[PDB]
Amino acid sequence: SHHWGYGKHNGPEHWHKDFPIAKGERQSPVDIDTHTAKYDPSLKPLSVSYDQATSLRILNNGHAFNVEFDDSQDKAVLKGGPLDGTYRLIQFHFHWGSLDGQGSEHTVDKKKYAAELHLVHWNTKYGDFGKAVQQPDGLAVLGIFLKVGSAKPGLQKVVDVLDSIKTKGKSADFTNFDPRGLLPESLDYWTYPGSLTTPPLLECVTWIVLKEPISVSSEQVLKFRKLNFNGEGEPEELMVDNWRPAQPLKNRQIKASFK
């Protein structure tokens, strides 16, 4: 009965009908205006501890594809930065475009990237993800821009398995993936309080959005575009433009860890 998507009739412009928080005061994504996003010197260094990250599976959920991690222990955690205590990595996914010029959720001085990576973490204060998503400080999503340029070696293992999860509901074993291979060199970041960028759009996310994009090749991102929103047997609907546009900032302050 309930569906949502990125199409003409079920798209971001309509999500409010089932999810009234879509018009809330803390919605993501947003545009980062660098002229207004002020350097905050009290922001601490971001601590990314992914050395023991344990990936398990990869799956097409009908909106994006997710790589899932074992979050039963502190094997892959985000700490410091703007955060209070310890946030475990549960999954990552991407949003991308039908063309190289668009695909990202966050924009920077109105500039769109080809795609955006989201590493999703939950506050261990709340015992599990389910309890976390319902708290204002429940999640931390580390957001990373993807520009088209040189191939990203650390992304190839993802790209290579995509032909096995073409359609909604498909999944595959996906062990030993190294998420450090998707990070840029600089951990300089912007931060602001926001939300999930898909329904149910819960306002439980501390956003950390990195200054430095990673590069991916034209052919790498092109592989993302050969996925399907639809299930097996249904009409083909290519999985492209699965991004929500910039939402009004309202009275939120985007703080910068760098000058």
Residues 6+ apart with CB under 8 A from 144: 116, 117, 119, 182, 183, 184, 209, 210, 213, 214
- Nearest partner of 196 among 19, 27, 2, 14, judged by Cα: 27
Q: Give the alpha-carbon dihedral of 33, 35, 37, 41, to 10 degrees.
A: 150
C-alpha to C-alpha distance for 226 and 256, rounded to whole angstroms: 36
φ, ψ of residue 122 to 5 degrees: the values are: -120, 145
Residue among 55 and 104 whose Cβ is closer to Zn ion: 104
> Token pair for residue 98?
């039908």
For residue 42, the minimal CB distance to Zn ion (Å) is 28
For residue 233, the minimal CB distance to Zn ion (Å) is 27
Binder of residue 131, out of Zn ion, a copy of itself, none (CB less than 5 to 8 A by kind)? a copy of itself
Catalytic: which of 14, 16, 63, 121?
A: 63
List of residues contacting a copy of itself (CB under 8 A): 18, 20, 126, 131, 135
Is residue 35 a known part of a binding site?
no
Is residue 175 a known part of a binding site?
no
Is residue 106 a known part of a binding site?
no
For residue 13, the minimal CB distance to a copy of itself (Å) is 18
> Token pair for residue 188?
């300089």
Residue among 18 and 241 whose Cβ is closer to a copy of itself: 18
Residue among 203 and 235 whose Cβ is closer to Zn ion: 203
Whether 35 is catalytic: no
> Token pair for residue 83?
């955060």
Is residue 167 a known part of a binding site?
no
List of residues contacting Zn ion (CB under 5 A): 118
Catalytic residues: 63
